[PDB]
Design a protein around this ligand. Structure first.
Ligand SMILES: NC(=O)c1ccc[n+]([C@@H]2O[C@H](COP(=O)([O-])OP(=O)(O)OC[C@H]3O[C@@H](n4cnc5c(N)ncnc54)[C@H](O)[C@@H]3O)[C@@H](O)[C@H]2O)c1
Ligand SMILES: NC(=O)c1ccc[n+]([C@@H]2O[C@H](COP(=O)([O-])OP(=O)(O)OC[C@H]3O[C@@H](n4cnc5c(N)ncnc54)[C@H](O)[C@@H]3O)[C@@H](O)[C@H]2O)c1
Lengths: 550, 550
C-alpha cells in the first residue's frame, strides 16, 4: 500500500481523460509530481523534503485519479492528508479540489504524534508542493536560492561573487538546486551529500558540475577555481556533521556557509555522524526515538560548526530546514545567533509580493515554455535582471517532467502574465492549457517563525491568520485547487501555509478568475507585510491600489 | 483602546445602513454580539468565554463598521484577529467576509505567547462565535447543555431527572445556560458562581431561578425541591475550588457533577481559591505568571473533588473548558478518569450532522422567530422531541438582543429549513432577512482532543484537516461569512475550528447558495465521522446520498 513498482508520468498532448481541463490539470500535475525525472522516491509516493508525499498511500492515489476523472464541473473534491474523502456540490468558479494536509491541533503538532497517526494509516506529510501537486523538480526552488546568494553577495561582497565560494550540504530534490544557484550567482560551491544516488541525480539533471574524491581533493578544486574566477559546483560524498567541524578545525574559510539537509525531520531526513544511510533507515523502523536523538545530537555539532564559521566573520545563514531549532533543543543555546535567509536577504522581495511564481505546460512541449519565456520578455521589457534569469534558465535548467518555468514576479505582473498566457492558449499559440502556481513559500501564504516570518519587525512571527485567509480568499476568487498544509519546510509544529494553482484554459471564464486570483494572491502578501509596517509594502500597496482599511 | 462606555445594539427593521442585506447582516450580527442584553462585557468588546472579543479594539471596531457599510456586492473583507486588514474583489456568490482569529503557529500556540502579542496590539481571542459574529446570548448553548443532561439521565437514571440534582459551576454567558438546561431536563441544580453580577445577569435573563444565602441554605433548598419533585435552579455565590472539596468532605452526593468555569484561560477566566475577582483582575496585570499558577493550582483541587465524587459513583463529566488538562499539568495524573461530554453523550448526534444549528431575525421582531418555529414543526412533523424543544424554547427561553433560535438538526433537515425560511422572506411572511449559522462546536467544523474529538474510535482526535476543509468548502459554496479560529472552548493550543453564517434574503441566488451550503456544512461532519469508522455516520451518509469516494 506504500510501495508500487511503477513509473508514473503525466499524460501529454491535448486528449483528456477527465471531463474538462480544470480536472485534467490536477490529474496531470499529481502524476507529474511522481515522474521518475521529477520525484526523489516516487515508488514510495515521496516527492521531496524528507517524507513529503503526493497521496497517502497507493489505494488513495488510485481513488484520487478515479475521482478526478469523473468529477463534474460544479463538484469539488476534498483531499484530507492525501486521501479523497468527499465530493460536494459548489459551482464552476470555485476550486475543483480543496486539499488540507498534515494539520494537527497544536498541542499534538509534533513528529512523534504524526508518526503514531501514520502507523494507523491516518497521516501524510504534504511538505509544501508535494501533497498539493505543483512540484516541478529542482527548478521550483532554484531562483529563490539564486536570489538569496545574489543578495548575500550584494550585502557582503559587492554583488557578483566571482572568486568566492559557498559551503553547504543537502543534494536532495530542493537542496540539489543549491550548486546551480551558486553557479548562476557566480560562486563556486562545495556541497556535501551522504547518498551517492542523490549526487548522481544532481549530476544527471545538470544541477551539480562535478564530484570530488575526498575533502582534500575538494579543497584543491575550490582553491583553483576560485583563484581563476570560475563558477563551478563540487559535490562531496560524506556527512556534514563530520565535514563542517573538520573544516573549522583546518581553518578553512568559505565565503558563505549554509545548510539544506532534511533537518526538519530527524527520523527521516538527517544522517547521524558515523552511520550509513542503510543503518539509519533500518534503525528508524526499530528504535525511532533513539534515531531522532542521534540525528539531533549530530545537528548540534553541525550547527556549532556553522556558529564557529560565523565567529570567523563568515556570512552564515539558515536556509529553511529548522536545523537551528533542533540544535537549540539539544543544548546549543545560541543556535539562533545566525539568521534565516528571509529576514536577512529575501523579505524585501516579499514586500512587493515577489516570490516563486511558476507555470507548467500541460501539453508536455518544451516550445510551449519557450513561447511563455518570450512573452514574459515582451510584457516586462525593461527588467534586465529578469531577462537574464530566463536566459540562464534556458541555458542551464533542464526540464524535469512536464516543461515548467520558475520566474519570480510580484503584485501586478502576476495577473498580467496569467491573462496573457490564457490569451495564448485561446489563440492556439500554446498547444494546450497551462497551469500557474507557486511554492507555499510566498509573501502571503506562510507563517513560519524560523523561516519566512522570522523576526518580523512588529514581532508577529507566529501569527498564522494570514495563510488561512489567503487560502480562503483563493477559494472565493476561483483558483482551480487550493491547499492548507502544516509543517512544510521546517517540520511538524513550525509552519502553516497555503497553496494555489489556477488553470489557464483559454476561456473568458478562466480570464475573469485569473485577473482576480493573481491580483489577490500576491495582494495578501503585500497586505501582510504592510500590516507589519514595512514601508516597501505600504508603498507597493499604494502603487497597486490595494484597499487596506487600516 | 479596549474600553468605550457605549451601548451598542443591532439596527432593526428593513432599512439598510450597508449596501445590501449580504453586508447589512454581518454589520447587524457584529453589533448584536455587543448588545448589553447579549454580551458579558461589551464595553471592553468581550462577548463570552473569558476574553472572547468581537473586534480587536475600538479603533478596529470602528473601521469594521465603516468598511462593512461601504463594501460592494463583489468585494470580500478580510478580518484578521478582529482587525479589518484588506478588501479584495471576488464575486457575489463568495462570502462577503472571511475571518481568521487567534491562529498561531503550533510551537507558539499558547497563552503566554498570545498575551505577548496582545500587549503589542497584535492579538484577539475569537472564542468560537465572539469573533465570528453569531453569538445569541445563553441560548446558543442551552439546547446542547440540555441534550447533555438528558443523555446522561438516560444512561444513568432511566431518563428523566425528577428528584435529582446537578452540581456545577460557572454562570457566565455560556455557563449561565446550565441552570435552565438542568431545569428543562427535569433536574434541580446548584450552580456556583464567583461574581454577583453574573448571578444577576442570569436572574435578569431568567436562566436561573433563585440565589441561596450560603452553602447550608443552598443544600436546604436542594433537599426540599428534589423531595417535592420540582426542577429549580439555585445560584450560590462562591468559589468552586472551595465548595466542591467541602461538599466532598461533608459526604454530599449530587446526582451529576460537571463544571463550566472559564478554566481554558487560567489568567482571565478562573478565580483561585480565596481570591476575589477584583484581586484576580488586578494581579493578572502585575504578576500574570503567578496568577496562572495560582489558578491552575486551584483547578487541580477542583478536579480532585470531581474525581472524588466520581469514585463515590456519581456521574461526572467534563463540559468543555479544558479543566482536566490544567489539573493534569499541575500534577493530577488521573484527571482524565472522567470523560468529556462529547464522547460520553453527544457524539451520536454529531454522527448524523446534528449540532447547534441556529438562526436570527435581522428585523428584531419576536414574531419572525415564532413564525419560523411554526414552520419547523410543519417541516418536521414527526419528531416529538424536537417539537417539545421548540415548545420549551417558546415557554422558557427569553430572547436576548435580536430574536434568535437554537434548534439542533442535522444533515438533510438543515437545507430543508433554510430553503423554507428563504421562501418566507421572499413571500413577506418574515418581515426581513434571517441569518442561519451555528456554533463552531459542530460535527464537521472542529478538532479538539479534550472536547469535540476526544477519544475518536480510530485515534484521529488531533487531526485538524477537517475544520480547515469545512471552511474552504463553505467559502466555495457561498456562505455569507466564513471563519477559521484557534483555541475556542478549550484555549490556546487545544483546538482549531470553523464558522459559517449564511443570509436568507429571499432571492433565488440565496436559494442556490443555501441548498448546497446547508448540505455541505453538516455533510462534512457526517463525512468526518464516517471516515473515523462510526457506523451511524456511514449509515447517515448512505441515507443522504453523500459522495464519499473511499
Ligand atoms: N528554504 C527553502 O526555500 C526551502 C524550500 C523547499 C524545501 N526546503 C527544505 O530543504 C531541506 C531539503 O529539502 P530536500 O527536498 O532537498 O530534501 P530531501 O529529503 O529530498 O534531501 C535531503 C538530503 O539531505 C541529505 N542528508 C541528510 N543528512 C545529511 C548529512 N548529515 N550530511 C550530508 N547530507 C545529508 C540526504 O541524503 C538527502 O539527499 C528540507 O528541510 C526542506 O523542508 C527549504
Ligand atoms: N461545552 C460547550 O459546548 C461550550 C460552549 C461554549 C463555551 N464553552 C466553555 O465554557 C466555559 C465558560 O464559558 P462562559 O461563556 O460562561 O465564560 P465566561 O468567561 O463568560 O464565564 C465564566 C464564569 O466562571 C466564573 N468562575 C471562574 N472561576 C470560578 C470559580 N473558581 N468558582 C466559581 N465561578 C468561577 C466567572 O465568575 C464567570 O462568570 C469556557 O471554558 C468556554 O470556553 C463550552
Amino acid at each position: 500500500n506504500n510501495y508500487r513498482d511503477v513509473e508514473i508520468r503525466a499524460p501529454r498532448g491535448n486528449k483528456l481523460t477527465a471531463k474538462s481541463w480544470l480536472t485534467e490539470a490536477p490529474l496531470r500535475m499529481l502524476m507529474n509530481n511522481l515522474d521518475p525525472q521529477v520525484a526523489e522516491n516516487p515508488k514510495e509516493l515521496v516527492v521531496y523534503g524528507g517524507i513529503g508525499r503526493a497521496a497517502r498511500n497507493w489505494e488513495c492515489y488510485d481513488k484520487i485519479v478515479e475521482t478526478l476523472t469523473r468529477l463534474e464541473d460544479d463538484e469539488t473534491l476534498l483531499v484530507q492528508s492525501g486521501k479523497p474523502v468527499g465530493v460536494f456540490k459548489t459551482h464552476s468558479n470555485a476550486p475543483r479540489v480543496l486539499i488540507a494536509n498534515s494539520n494537527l491541533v497544536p498541542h499534538w503538532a509534533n513528529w512523534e504524534h504524526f508518526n503514531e497517526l501514520d502507523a494507523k494509516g491516518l497521516a501524510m506529510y504534504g511538505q509544501m508542493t508535494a501533497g498539493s501537486w505543483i512540484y516541478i523538480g529542482s527548478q521550483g526552488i532554484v531562483q529563490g536560492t539564486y536570489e538569496t546568494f545574489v543578495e548575500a553577495g550584494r550585502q557582503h561582497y559587492g554583488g557578483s561573487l566571482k572568486g568566492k565560494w559557498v559551503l553547504t550540504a543537502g543534494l536532495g530534490g530542493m537542496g540539489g538546486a543549491q550548486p546551480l544557484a551558486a553557479t548562476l550567482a557566480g560562486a563556486c560551491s562545495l556541497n556535501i551529500e551522504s547518498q551517492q544516488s542523490r549526487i548522481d541525480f544532481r549530476l544527471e539533471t545538470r544541477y551539480v558540475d562535478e564530484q570530488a574524491t575526498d575533502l582534500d581533493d575538494a579543497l584543491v578544486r575550490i582553491a583553483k577555481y576560485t583563484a581563476e574566477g570560475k563558477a563551478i559546483s563540487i559535490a562531496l560524498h560524506g556527512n556534514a556533521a563530520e565535514i563542517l567541524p573538520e573544516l573549522v578545525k583546518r581553518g578553512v574559510r568559505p565565503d558563505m556557509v549554509t545548510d539544506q539537509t532534511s533537518a526538519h525531520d530527524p527520523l527521516n531526513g538527517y544522517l547521524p555522524a558515523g552511520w550509513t544511510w542503510e543503518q539509519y533507515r533500518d534503525r528508524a523502523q526499530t528504535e525511532p526515538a533513539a534515531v531522532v536523538k542521534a540525528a539531533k545530537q549530530s545537528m548540534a555539532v553541525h550547527v556549532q560548526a556553522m556558529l564557529d564559521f560565523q565567529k570567523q566573520g563568515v556570512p552564515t545563514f539558515d536556509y529553511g530546514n529548522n536545523i537551528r531549532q533542533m540544535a537549540k533543543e539539544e543544548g546549543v543555546a545560541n543556535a539562533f545567533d545566525f539568521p534565516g535567509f528571509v529576514p536577512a536577504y529575501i523579505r524585501p522581495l516579499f514586500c512587493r509580493g515577489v516570490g516563486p511564481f511558476r507555470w507548467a505546460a500541460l501539453s508536455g512541449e518544451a516550445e510551449d515554455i519557450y513561447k511563455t519565456d518570450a512573452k514574459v520578455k515582451e510584457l516586462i521589457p525593461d527588467d534586465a535582471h529578469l531577462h537574464r534569469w530566463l536566459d540562464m534558465a534556458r541555458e542551464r535548467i533542464s526540464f524535469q517532467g512536464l516543461p515548467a518555468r520558475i520566474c519570480w514576479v510580484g503584485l501586478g505582473l502576476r495577473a498580467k502574465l496569467g491573462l496573457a498566457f490564457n490569451e495564448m492558449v485561446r489563440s492556439g499559440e500554446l498547444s494546450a492549457p497551462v497551469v500557474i502556481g507557486r511554492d507555499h513559500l510566498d509573501s502571503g501564504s506562510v507563517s513560519s517563525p524560523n523561516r519566512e516570518t522570522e523576526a518580523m519587525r512588529d514581532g508577529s512571527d507566529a501569527v498564522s491568520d494570514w495563510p488561512l485567509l489567503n487560502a480562503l480568499l483563493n477559494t472565493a476568487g476561483g483558483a482551480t485547487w487550493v491547499s492548507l498544509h502544516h509543517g512544510g519546510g521546517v517540520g511538524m509544529g513550525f509552519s502553516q501555509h497555503s497553496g494555489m494553482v489556477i488553470v489557464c484554459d483559454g476561456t473568458d471564464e478562466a480570464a475573469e478568475r485569473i485577473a482576480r486570483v493573481l491580483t489577490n494572491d500576491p495582494g495578501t502578501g503585500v497586505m501582510r507585510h504592510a500590516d507589519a509596517g514595512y514601508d516597501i509594502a505600504i508603498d507597493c500597496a499604494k502603487e497597486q491600489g490595494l484597499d487596506l482599511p487600516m
